[PDB]
Amino acid sequence: MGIPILKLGECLLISIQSELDDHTAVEFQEDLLAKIHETSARGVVIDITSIDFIDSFIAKILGDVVSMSKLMGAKVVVTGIQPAVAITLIELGITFSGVLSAMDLESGLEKLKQELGE
């Protein structure tokens, strides 16, 4: 499907396969938000570890959906950014404060267990 099915213990856990287009990523923002409407979770975990290339057009969407789902009412971490994509993501001039990027998926939920439910 490209999008996963996602539900995990008063949080969420969304994975992302290898993708290249912004015809997938436009509905993908609605595919993430429509779950967090019905499922009332106080934080998602987006994982972009499998990707090796994100263009400057698609980097707006992942540069938005962190700020989008915060406005919905859930914190957003982004886990496992590759070194190739993390260089070219800066050329999209970010103001990333509120990203809370962990290193891998195992230490990712240890951060949202610290934020949610102390």
Partner 1 sequence: KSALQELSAPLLPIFEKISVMPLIGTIDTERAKLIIENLLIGVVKNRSEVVLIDITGVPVVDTMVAHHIIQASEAVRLVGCQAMLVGIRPEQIITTNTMKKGMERALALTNREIVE
19 lies in the binding site for partner 1 (CB under 8 A): no
Q: How far is the CB of 36 from partner 1 (least distance, A)?
A: 8
81 lies in the binding site for a copy of itself (CB under 8 A): no
Q: Are 46 and 25 in contact (CB under 8 A)?
A: no
Stretch 5-44 residues interacting with a copy of itself (CB under 8 A):
5-9, 13, 15, 17-18
Tell me, what DSSP letter sits at residue 11? B
104 lies in the binding site for partner 1 (CB under 8 A): yes
Which string of b and e fits 74-110 if b means at least 16 CB within 10 Å? bbbbbbbbeeeeeeebeeeeeeeeeebbbeeeeebbe
Q: For binding to partner 1 (CB under 8 A), which residues are involved? A: 29-30, 33-34, 37, 40, 42, 64, 67-74, 78, 80-84, 86-87, 89-90, 94, 96, 99, 101-104, 107
